[PDB]
Amino acid sequence: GSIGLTVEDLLSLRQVVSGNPEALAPLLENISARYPQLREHIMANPEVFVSMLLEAV
Amino acid sequence: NNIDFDSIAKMLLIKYKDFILSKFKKAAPVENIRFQNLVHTNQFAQGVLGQSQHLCTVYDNPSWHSIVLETLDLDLIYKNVDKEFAKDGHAEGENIYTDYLVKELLRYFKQDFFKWCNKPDCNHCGQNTSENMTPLGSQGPNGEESKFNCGTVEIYKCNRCGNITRFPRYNDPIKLLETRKGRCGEWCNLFTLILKSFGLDVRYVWNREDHVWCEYFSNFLNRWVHVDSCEQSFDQPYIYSINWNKKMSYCIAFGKDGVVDVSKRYILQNELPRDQIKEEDLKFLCQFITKRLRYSLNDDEIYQLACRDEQEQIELIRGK
Numbered sequence: 001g002s003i004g005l006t007v008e009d010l011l012s013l014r015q016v017v018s019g020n021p022e023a024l025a026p027l028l029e030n031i032s033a034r035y036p037q038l039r040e041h042i043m044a045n046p047e048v049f050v051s052m053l054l055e056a057v
Numbered sequence: 058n059n060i061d062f063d064s065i066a067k068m069l070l071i072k073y074k075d076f077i078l079s080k081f082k083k084a085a086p087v088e089n090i091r092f093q094n095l096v097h098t099n100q101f102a103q104g105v106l107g108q109s110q111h112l113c114t115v116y117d118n119p120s121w122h123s124i125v126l127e128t129l130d131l132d133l134i135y136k137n138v139d140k141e142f143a144k145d146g147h148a149e150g151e152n153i154y155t156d157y158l159v160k161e162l163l164r165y166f167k168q169d170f171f172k173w174c175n176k177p178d179c180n181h182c183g184q185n186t187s188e189n190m191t192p193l194g195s196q197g198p199n200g201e202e203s204k205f206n207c208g209t210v211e212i213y214k215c216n217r218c219g220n221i222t223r224f225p226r227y228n229d230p231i232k233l234l235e236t237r238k239g240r241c242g243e244w245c246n247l248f249t250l251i252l253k254s255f256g257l258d259v260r261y262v263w264n265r266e267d268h269v270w271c272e273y274f275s276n277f278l279n280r281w282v283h284v285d286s287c288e289q290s291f292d293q294p295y296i297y298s299i300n301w302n303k304k305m306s307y308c309i310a311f312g313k314d315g316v317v318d319v320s321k322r323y324i325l326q327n328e329l330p331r332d333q334i335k336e337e338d339l340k341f342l343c344q345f346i347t348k349r350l351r352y353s354l355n356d357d358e359i360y361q362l363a364c365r366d367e368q369e370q371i372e373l374i375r376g377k
């Protein structure tokens with residue numbers, strides 16, 4: 001299915017990926033410490049997860 | 058568990074890069090039609106396509122650059138920029154110098170170089186004469202003044218000697234380089250080129266409600282910056298919508314590297330209706346033209362820009 005990302009996150013997400021790749025992990029971190037449902041896709045397969053992300057752009 | 062993310066971060070940056078490159082690759086003919094369509098379907102679109110075909114390149118012409126570089130007083134310019142730099146102690150070893158340059162070109166142009174022309178001065182009479190001028194309206198260019206890029210001459214009658222003085226409206230920036238006067242049209246035209254002659258990264262920004270200006274990329278500020286040469290103004294996009302309190306509809310900018318809708322930068326109140334074109338179309342339109350425009354660049358130039366793009370998008374919608 002679809003991501004389910006906050007308009008503010010999905011934004012700053014695509015901000016830092018394009019503007020500050022250095023900080024993209026700690027973002028990726030906290031973003032997960034906050035979306036239970038997503039943390040799942042991460043735990044049980046980073047791959048699926050990242051593909052989902054690229055859907056937002 | 059205990060996920061740890063760089064393992065996953067890095068994976069992303071990588072698949073993101075490829076994503077981006079794919080976008081700015083193939084000119085897939087599904088679009089070739091959707092595009093082609095729109096340029097006949099809606100004429101607004103047609104409008105901007107035409108504008109891009111002119112603006113997005115005319116200014117990247119190195120004969121011109123050198124003519125202007127001859128013509129300006131590069132001495133006085135740099136002299137000042139160096140004065141105003143010495144005063145600064147901003148950031149250690151930083152690109153801020155080029156900002157000063159702009160700011161100085163900004164004052165040079167306005168204070169010394171170029172003149173504002175409300176109604177022309179009466180060429181027979183003295184020099185500072187322009188109210189004993191009454192408008193007779195417009196006419197086609199005298200053929201001689203079609204040598205330059207003039208499609209219409211506003212004409213004036215002097216009330217003191219009763220002679221006609223003409224004010225032709227030219228688009229050849231070099232011509233302006235000699236007449237040295239005009240309105241925002243000419244003001245912006247020449248000043249855009251002045252800027253490009255320093256090989257600054259510049260955009261020409263068209264506001265549908267009869268006003269134009271330009272954008273320059275300050276590297277030190279790391280983003281596009283609003284420069285208007287008429288108003289002698291550096292970085293204050295609000296000027297129009299709040300200070301002038303001007304009603305605005307569409308603001309779009311054209312530069313050699315892209316055509317982008319810069320409305321949300323400027324139209325921060327007094328927002329007219331958008332509706333010469335469906336929103337999704339206008340997006341596409343640009344993206345498409347930008348693509349066509351960037352067609353022949355190495356892979357990492359392409360990425361690097363597409364990033365600076367998304368930087369802007371985030372600055373526009375988040376409208377800081």
Ligand SMILES: OC[C@H]1O[C@@](CO)(O[C@H]2O[C@H](CO)[C@@H](O)[C@H](O)[C@H]2O)[C@@H](O)[C@@H]1O
Nearest residue numbers: 240241266267268269287288300301303
């Ligand atoms: O006002 C819009 C229109 O007027 C111009 C020239 O006539 O600018 C004038 O208006 C501004 C305030 O409304 C003034 O700040 C400016 O100095 C004055 O010349 C154009 O710039 C503009 O297209």
Ligand SMILES: OC[C@H]1O[C@@](CO)(O[C@H]2O[C@H](CO)[C@@H](O)[C@H](O)[C@H]2O)[C@@H](O)[C@@H]1O
Nearest residue numbers: 285286287288289290291293296300301
């Ligand atoms: O002549 C206009 C020129 O002066 C500046 C100098 O900083 O300040 C002006 O900004 C506003 C409109 O341009 C005005 O409301 C203000 O009173 C005026 O001083 C520049 O902004 C501008 O280019």
Ligand SMILES: [Zn+2]
Nearest residue numbers: 179182215218
């Ligand atoms: Zn006269």
